[PDB]
Amino acid sequence: SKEYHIDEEVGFALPNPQENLPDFYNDWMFIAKHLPDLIESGQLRERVEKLNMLSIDHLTDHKSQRLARLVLGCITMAYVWGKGHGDVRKVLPRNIAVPYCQLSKKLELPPILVYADCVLANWKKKDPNKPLTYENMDVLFSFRDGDCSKGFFLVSLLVEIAAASAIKVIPTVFKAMQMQERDTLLKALLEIASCLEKALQVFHQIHDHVNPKAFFSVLRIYLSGWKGNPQLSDGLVYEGFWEDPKEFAGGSAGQSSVGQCFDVLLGIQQTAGGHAAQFLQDMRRYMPPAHRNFLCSLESNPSVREFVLSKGDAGLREAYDACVKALVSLRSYHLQIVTKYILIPASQQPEAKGTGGTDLMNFLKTVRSTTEKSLLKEG
Ligand code: HEM
Ligand SMILES: N[C@@H](Cc1c[nH]c2ccccc12)C(=O)O
Ligand SMILES: OCCc1c[nH]c2ccccc12
Ligand SMILES: [C-]#N
């Protein structure tokens, strides 16, 4: 849509990703599809090292290129972390690193597994005729058995899909403001709030499909990166591409465009900077180039917040606040998820840091506080 690559149904997610790569890249696909066994047996690192350097010229279309990022990304996590108990690799082999860095530079992403790879491009629906729902859906790749990566990635994707129904309304909002259509704008804001209220109901599903203790110990360490990590302090070195090591943050739904999309829409100045603003601005370089341009386009438009405040209209303020309260609800709920899935598990292991690399609990509360302080009320 307007070459921002936002689908009506699935939003920022890649609609119907490719499952198979071309025959030339089978050596990659065998390692990626059999990750749980190769890590467990302990021949994952041997297979990656004994591997030819494959050129990325044969990947024709965009879906082929992104599938390769997902394939190469999951292998890079598997190689660096290994069994995930302590033993790590600081150097990444030239035969896998150089094609991955060249592919990453083409798509304007960092050479590391990101939200766009492991959530947005890491899914398939089982029956094409059936609708988008957890029973019908499945991921393409997993790290280990009992990591709960299916339940984890698909619930993130299902909320992304829930937010898509709000994202398609955004043109109506800016069209109504320009054309000076009060009733259209009020209806559009209420529709967005309704869609954001529904995304919170989709969020409830995470308790059914993700074990807290299994998520923290097993899956979290594979999603982690190497930007301010004590295990890789200097960072990872990509052989035959850069001389020194390079630091790149781990995967996180901080790299989701939906969070910033609606804050930017509603004039919630998160990136206006401080400790928390710095992080959210950095995450846009881990987003795809098209979605980075979408968040650009929203900031360029006239402020929806300024428009609503000027009119002296309790109806518009209600509808505006409905959207803002929905965001406060999502962020209030997301903190309860963090309490269950990080804080309580972390205390059982004989300010904690997230995969993105932030003092998470004070970071998230600052972000929620900024959202809550944007409620208009009586003007
Ligand atoms: C077990 C599940 C989850 C955990 C443990 C978790 C944890 C965190 C943590 C620690 C942060 C702070 C940044 C960082 O250090 O990475 C964060 C940020 C964020 N998370 Fe999650 N998260 C989970 C699920 C979700 C889901 C399902 C979504 C959306 C569909 C989401 C959206 C976000 C967003 C947008 C941010 C950026 C800050 C903000 O805008 O509020 N998270 N998450
Ligand atoms: N940031 C989370 C991990 C996480 C949550 N949602 C994600 C989506 C994709 C990749 C990683 C994540 C943590 O520190 O535990
Ligand atoms: O931290 C909560 C995640 C979140 C923030 N804003 C959103 C908008 C839609 C869906 C999820 C979120
Ligand atoms: C959410 N990371």
185 shares its domain with 241: no
Q: What angle do CA 250, 123, 154 make, to 5 degrees?
A: 70
**SS3 at position 351:** coil
CA 368 / ligand 4 centre spacing (Å): 14
Amino acid at residue number 14: L
- With a CB cutoff of 8 Å and minimum separation 6, the contacts of 238 are 92, 97, 98, 100, 101, 111, 246
| Resolution of the PDB structure in angstroms | 2.7
CATH of the domain at 163: 1.20.58.480
**SS3 at position 24:** helix
- With a CB cutoff of 8 Å and minimum separation 6, the contacts of 151 are 206, 208, 209, 210
Last residue of a domain, one of 232, 248, 264: 248
Write out the H or E segment, with its range, that includes residue 91: strand 91-92
How many structural domains does the chain have? 2
54 shares its domain with 197: no
253 shares its domain with 360: yes
Closest CA to 93 of 47, 129, 137: 47
319 shares its domain with 346: yes
Task: Confirm if 377 and 317 have CB atoms less than 8 A apart.
Answer: yes
Tell me how far apart the alpha carbons of residues 257 and 76 are, in angstroms, rounded to a whole number: 24
Last residue of a domain, one of 215, 248, 281: 248
Task: Confirm if 267 and 304 have CB atoms less than 8 A apart.
Answer: yes
Tell me how far apart the alpha carbons of residues 267 and 279 are, in angstroms, rounded to a whole number: 18
State the residue range of the domain holding 239. 18-145+224-248
- The reply to whether ligand 3 has any atom less than 6 angstroms from the CB of 331 is yes
Tokens 């401080």 belong to 274
79 shares its domain with 204: no
Tell me how far apart the alpha carbons of residues 85 and 377 are, in angstroms, rounded to a whole number: 51
CA 334 / ligand 1 centre spacing (Å): 7
Count of positions (residues) in the chain: 379
Tell me how far apart the alpha carbons of residues 283 and 287 are, in angstroms, rounded to a whole number: 7
Task: Confirm if 257 and 291 have CB atoms less than 8 A apart.
Answer: yes
- The reply to whether ligand 4 has any atom less than 6 angstroms from the CB of 212 is no
- The reply to whether ligand 4 has any atom less than 6 angstroms from the CB of 259 is no
31 shares its domain with 129: yes
**SS3 at position 210:** coil
Look up residue 13 and give its DSSP letter.
S
- The reply to whether ligand 4 has any atom less than 6 angstroms from the CB of 337 is no
Of the residues 6, 331, 337, 338, which should be mutated to test ligand 3's pocket, given the most ligand atoms within 8 Å of the CB?
331
Tell me how far apart the alpha carbons of residues 20 and 25 are, in angstroms, rounded to a whole number: 10
Could you tell me the two tokens for 255? 């790299």
Tell me how far apart the alpha carbons of residues 188 and 259 are, in angstroms, rounded to a whole number: 19
Write out the H or E segment, with its range, that includes residue 196: helix 182-203
216 shares its domain with 342: yes
Could you tell me the two tokens for 299? 């900031």
- With a CB cutoff of 8 Å and minimum separation 6, the contacts of 23 are none
166 shares its domain with 233: no
Q: Which residue(s) pair with 353 in the sheet? A: 359
Phi and psi angles of residue 246, each rounded to the nearest 5 degrees, phi first? -130, 140
- The reply to whether ligand 1 has any atom less than 6 angstroms from the CB of 159 is yes
206 shares its domain with 124: no
Q: What is the per-residue DSSP string for 251-277? A: P-GGG-HHHHHHHHHTT--S----HHH
Write out the H or E segment, with its range, that includes residue 74: helix 62-81
141 shares its domain with 183: no
318 shares its domain with 231: no
Q: Which residue(s) pair with 230 in the sheet? A: none
Residue 181: left (phi > 0), alpha (psi -120 to 50), or beta? beta
Q: Which residue(s) pair with 236 in the sheet? A: 246
Residue 6: left (phi > 0), alpha (psi -120 to 50), or beta? beta
| Alpha-carbon distances, residue 176 vs 53, 57, 304 (angstroms) | 54, 46, 10
358 shares its domain with 213: yes
5 known member of a binding site: no
